[PDB]
Amino acid sequence: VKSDDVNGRTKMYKNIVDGNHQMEPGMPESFNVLLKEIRSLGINIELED
Amino acid sequence: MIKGKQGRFRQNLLGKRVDYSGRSVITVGPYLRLHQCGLPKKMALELFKPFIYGKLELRGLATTIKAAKKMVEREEAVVWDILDEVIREHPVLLNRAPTLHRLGIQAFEPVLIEGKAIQLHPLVCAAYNADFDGDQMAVHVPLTLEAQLEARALMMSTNNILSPANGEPIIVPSQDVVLGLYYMTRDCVNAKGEGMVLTGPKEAERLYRSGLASLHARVKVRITEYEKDANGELVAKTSLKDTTVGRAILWMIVPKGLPYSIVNQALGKKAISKMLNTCYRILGLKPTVIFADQIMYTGFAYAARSGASVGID
Amino acid sequence: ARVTVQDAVEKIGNRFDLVLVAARRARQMQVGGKDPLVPEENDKTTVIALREIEEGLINNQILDVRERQEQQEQEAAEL
Amino acid sequence: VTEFLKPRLVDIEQVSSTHAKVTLEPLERGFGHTLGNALRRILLSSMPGCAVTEVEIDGVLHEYSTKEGVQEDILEILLNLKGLAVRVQGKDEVILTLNKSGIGPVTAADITHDGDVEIVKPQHVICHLTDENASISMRIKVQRGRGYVPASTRRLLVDACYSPVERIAYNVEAARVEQRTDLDKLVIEMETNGTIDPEEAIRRAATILAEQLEAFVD
Amino acid sequence: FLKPRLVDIEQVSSTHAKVTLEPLERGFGHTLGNALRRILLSSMPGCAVTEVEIDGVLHEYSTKEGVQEDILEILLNLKGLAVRVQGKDEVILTLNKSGIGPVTAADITHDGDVEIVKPQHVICHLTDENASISMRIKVQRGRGYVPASTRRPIGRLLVDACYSPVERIAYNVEAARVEQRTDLDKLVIEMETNGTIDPEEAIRRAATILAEQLEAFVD
Amino acid sequence: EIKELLKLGDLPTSGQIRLYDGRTGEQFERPVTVGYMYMLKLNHLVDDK
Amino acid sequence: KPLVGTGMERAVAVDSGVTAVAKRGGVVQYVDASRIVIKVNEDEMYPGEAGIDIYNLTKYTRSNQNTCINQMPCVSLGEPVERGDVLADGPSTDLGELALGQNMRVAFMPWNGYNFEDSILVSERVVQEDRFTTIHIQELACVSRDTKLGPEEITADIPNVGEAALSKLDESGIVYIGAEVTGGDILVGKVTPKDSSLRVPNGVSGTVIDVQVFTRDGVEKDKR
RNA sequence: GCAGAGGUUCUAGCUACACCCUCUAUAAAAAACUAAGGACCACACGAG
Ligand SMILES: NCc1c[nH]c2nc(N)[nH]c(=O)c12
Ligand SMILES: [Mg+2]
């Protein structure tokens, strides 16, 4: 939430001023950068479900 | 751009830089208890900005976020009163730069002060390995409710007394308090007030403050030595023990459970650490935090009266 | 205000369970409209939970029973 | 330019009838020490009190000696007497005689009245008696002095503790008044033998000081 | 008991004097001797310059032709000026000098009330034969040290004010020579003033402050 | 030579004098060292931190 | 000056460039806070075109570390001056003798823990005497680029601002030389072609000492 | 923006996660709602 989560920062900046101190993790943009920097290397790395 | 100390795996994924941070130089901060640390106002105002906005909205002072921002930048009288609310029970993490081991990053309860330096309880200036020759600590803030509760139930400076490497305590009195206690617990073979009989420590402190008796003097006093020999019960025994005025004054600071065979010797440094360890072992944690906080006050106060200076002779 | 939490962790032995069982109580005091059973005095909503746990008024079972009762009460209104 | 911040005390945390904690929030900057230390030095060693000064055991003349039937030596007996808190009236000197025989502690209640002498701690033990045939008897001398006159600077000689105060400790911490910067927040913890309450002790110790400065009050 | 009285005031020079308080009972002489010093060093009514406006210079860091001193040096010299005012809490002092030669505090035009106690205090030196300087000095009362920062036109300079007539207070306790008593101590206080406040009235004010403060915790 | 210079004025030869506490007003036992030391101010000021 | 110095203080100030050593011997004809005029002797001067020598002192100028570089006169009218002699004390230099700090009365003792392990307690007398208040000259620069859609303006007509901020601004859009600006104040007015005016960084509270304007050939110089 | 349109203000302000209001052809009566573009390399410095 603090460092890099585009849907986490803009959510908790509204949650705090609202009155409730909640959290939503999202997933860091740096990981979405590492995924691209490995996918563009000819190596297919994905996530299961 | 993947491997090495510059790659993602060690620069942008593990060590993400964080918001709600800060930095400043260190100061002695002696008065604050070991569960609280100083904080400049001009820093705590910027750290807790969203909380201030929310509290202003609750008060109705600001209709929108824009007005709240304007009044925060005004730094008027109302904003400080609001800041003294969101700071009440909100721990912050005082993090040293090269945190080698677990005790490097601890929690503290803020106490707003003027100036521009972060204060620090002296007894925790050993676990940090933090000097005062211009060192720089970084202040972080926990935001979520779980984080606030965690920085209270695990990270408060009163929660990690014993280091994880070994059972020995990590808040051992370090430089001035130990010298003051050592100068307190001694004996000169001839000082004014030698061989007298004293009613108790309540009277010894008065007989020393008046100047009628020197700090070191072999005398005879009576002491209520409390014993925990009965399981869960405190047995009170009182015997006319022979000791110095300085040692007798030191008796009132120690809790009741501990015996009298600890504050009677010369009281170097290892003796003080062992005294703290025994207090923790046989009295718990709550009556050891108070004892370790009171011992620093006594040590400083009686190392200031000593005038322990170094001269060529 | 509480500085030493050793009294609380005797009620909840893990002291990792203590934080998780106090966060729910603090949430039920911040978002939820419920009132603290301990007499509140100037304290924030995050140490009131620890104060309640110290008194033995709250543990991992009591709050679950209370939320089950809330569920039953909601079922009553469903008719 | 002569406007001075006069304090307004917030609470008086009275623990018991002999312990208290007086405090003053704004006070004045650098005035906390100037008031607390002055009060400590005036009341710790100068007060119109009264206590014992000298005892004479009818059987023992030499200080390093012991009697029979008592588990407390006269080294310990004389130590139990200087703590005995007694208040008298305008009379500046009176002799107290203690006469009791029987197994059991000789509490302060067994002291002969001898007139208008008042004792604040009847349960104050003096010397526990272990022999039924043993009989203890002595004479207690009291005076209306000041301070604490040790016997080393002066027939048994026992240190006289006239001043009713037993312990004094002041502190000073920052107490900002709202926007105004923090100054001094005096806090005083008094402990008294029991003749007079701590509040009366302070309100009599301040009278002496404020009455000393009577020729320099503009 | 006994009562201390202001028995003797003697001045060794124009700056500092030695007051005396003859009868005091043992221990007091060391209590008053510290109370009357801590009070004296921290709160006394003194007058010091606060705002200096020179005719031609805009800001502090600007040299002025014909003056040996930098304007900052002139301000720092003026901060140490020792003057006393009688009736009005605020006053404006006008300095007008011309020609080669040092300027001194005595060159300031004197009103009915404001009088300078050290007319040898040099402010600035005039070097050129056709140089001139005219400054307005604002002098006011005060208590303690008030920095300029914590307190409109560009041509008005600000100087920190230090209202403290007393510099160095020392005391000692000597045994009195009463013909029939003992343990009686007389007290002597030395007060290195700047020359504005009188000793006896200084002691009286520093004791009235105590008399007001003590009335808090007493009936 | 330092000792001779000290004796040239009045100050005690050993170089330590009896200070007095400011708050209490009492005396300091074990007289302490006093003198004049050259002290620079390093430019690592706190206003830039 | 250092109350106790090695003896190499009269050789670091002179040999460096901070001071202004006189290259000719004579007498001082006219001193001032910004210039010193020395009338040379007869022997030390050339037979023709000798005249007299003038030194110009550098007043407050920003250094590479944002500290003040100032020269103060060290002589007076009529005082003879010999060859190779200092007569202009530089920054951190007294009487042609290196002087970096200020000697202070120091006592070695623990004082209630306020000097715990390396801390240094400092009396109010230090601040009152202003023995350590240093100057810090700092430089700011506003640039008017030539972007697309039109160049930016330097004018003082700032939209969506109050009348308070423009009080410290002249007609041409430049702050008055001598104003006392603080954090967040507006220094020079630059409006981007649709509010980009330079502002003092937060915390800085100083006085403008001088403003120098550079103009490119071809564009018109404004009034200021 | 009920859908379309316009909007007080407190940069800009139907999306950035957005949000609300009044109105019926086009702007004008009103309060409550948010936080922006900054890479690499050399030199010097401080602390552990
Ligand atoms: N900007 C015009 C306007 C005024 N009020 C508004 N409120 C909302 N939610 N959005 C807007 O765009 C506006
Ligand atoms: Mg260090």
Q: Is G192:G177 a contact under the CB 8 Å cutoff?
A: no
Taking residue E196's Cβ as centre, other Cβ atoms within 10 Å add up to: 21
Q: Quote the CA–CA distance of E81 and E68 in Å, as a whole number.
A: 19
If you ran DSSP here, which 8-state letter would residue B162 be given?
A: B
The integer distance in angstroms from the CA atom of G149 to the C1' atom of H2 is 40
Q: Quote the CA–CA distance of E213 and D108 in Å, as a whole number.
A: 41
Taking residue F16's Cβ as centre, other Cβ atoms within 10 Å add up to: 22
If you ran DSSP here, which 8-state letter would residue D30 be given?
A: T
Q: Is A1:A25 a contact under the CB 8 Å cutoff?
A: yes
Residues E64, G176: C-beta atoms closer than 8 Å: no
Q: Is E41:E166 a contact under the CB 8 Å cutoff?
A: yes
The set of residues with CB closer than 7 Å to nucleic strand H is: A 6-7, 10-11, 13-14, 17; B 6, 57, 62-67, 69, 97-98, 129, 131, 133-136; F 44; G 160, 195
Q: Quote the CA–CA distance of B280 and B265 in Å, as a whole number.
A: 20
Q: Quote the CA–CA distance of B155 and B149 in Å, as a whole number.
A: 10
| Domain residue limits at D71 | 48-161
Residue to test with chain C: of B34, B36, B146, B156, most C Cβ within 10 A:
B146
If you ran DSSP here, which 8-state letter would residue E187 be given?
A: E
Instruction: Note the residue count of chain G.
Output: 224
Using an 8 Å CB-CB cutoff, list chain C residues near B152: 5, 46-47, 50
Q: Per the structure block, which two tokens stand in for B200?
A: 């108790």
Q: Per the structure block, which two tokens stand in for F6?
A: 């000290």
D34–chain B nearest CA distance, Å: 17
The integer distance in angstroms from the CA atom of G190 to the C1' atom of H46 is 38
Residues F36, G2: C-beta atoms closer than 8 Å: no
What three-state secondary structure class fits C7?
helix
Cβ-proximal residues to D127 (8 Å cutoff; 6+ apart), any chain: D70, D72, D76, D77, D80, D105, D106, D136
Q: Per the structure block, which two tokens stand in for B29?
A: 């901060």
Cα distances (angstroms) measured from residue A47 to each of A27, A32, A34, A35, D185: 13, 11, 13, 10, 63
If you ran DSSP here, which 8-state letter would residue E158 be given?
A: E
Instruction: Note the residue count of chain C.
Output: 79
Closest CA to D31 of D170, D180, D199: D170
Helical segments of chain E, H only: 28-42, 71-79, 199-214
Given this structure, which CATH class describes domain C1-74? Answer: alpha beta
What three-state secondary structure class fits E155?
coil
D206 interfaces chain E, CB cutoff of 8 Å: yes
Side-chain half-sphere of B72: how many Cα atoms within 13 Å?
Answer: 26
Nearest nucleotide to B67 (CA to C1') is H10
Cβ-proximal residues to B119 (8 Å cutoff; 6+ apart), any chain: B26, B27, B28, B29, B32, B37, B38, B39, B111, B113
Positions of chain H reached by protein Cβ under 7 A: 9-12, 16-17, 31-35, 41, 45-48
E136 pairs with which residues across the strands? E53, E94
- F28 closest CB neighbour out of B136, B307, B313: B307
Q: Quote the CA–CA distance of G7 and G5 in Å, as a whole number.
A: 6
If you ran DSSP here, which 8-state letter would residue B142 be given?
A: -
Q: Quote the CA–CA distance of E163 and D1 in Å, as a whole number.
A: 11
Q: Is B145:B36 a contact under the CB 8 Å cutoff?
A: no
D87 pairs with which residues across the strands? D118
Q: Quote the CA–CA distance of D30 and E215 in Å, as a whole number.
A: 18
Helical segments of chain G, H only: 124-128
Express the helix, strand and coil content of chain F in percent, nearest 5 each: 20, 25, 55
CATH of the domain at E70: 2.170.120.12
Taking residue F5's Cβ as centre, other Cβ atoms within 10 Å add up to: 9
D33 interfaces chain F, CB cutoff of 8 Å: yes
Q: Quote the CA–CA distance of D98 and D153 in Å, as a whole number.
A: 27
* C76 Cα distance to chain centroid: 25
Resolution of the coordinates in A?
4.3
Q: Quote the CA–CA distance of B244 and E153 in Å, as a whole number.
A: 69
Q: Per the structure block, which two tokens stand in for E111?
A: 């009103």
All structural domains of chain C with their residue ranges? 1-74
Q: Quote the CA–CA distance of E78 and E161 in Å, as a whole number.
A: 10
User: Burial of A31 by CB count in 10 Å (0-12 exposed, 13-18 middle, 19+ buried)?
Assistant: middle
Q: Quote the CA–CA distance of B2 and E114 in Å, as a whole number.
A: 79
Which stretches of chain B sit within 8 Å of chain G by CB?
A: 27-28, 30, 73, 122, 125, 131-133, 174-177, 179-180, 296, 300-301, 303-304, 306-310
Which stretches of chain B sit within 8 Å of chain C by CB?
A: 33, 35, 88-90, 145-146, 148-150, 152-154, 156, 158-159, 284-286, 289
B74 interfaces chain D, CB cutoff of 8 Å: no
Residues B305, F15: C-beta atoms closer than 8 Å: no
**Residue B115 CA to ligand 2 centre (angstroms):** 20
Nearest nucleotide to F44 (CA to C1') is H46
AA identity, residue E78: L
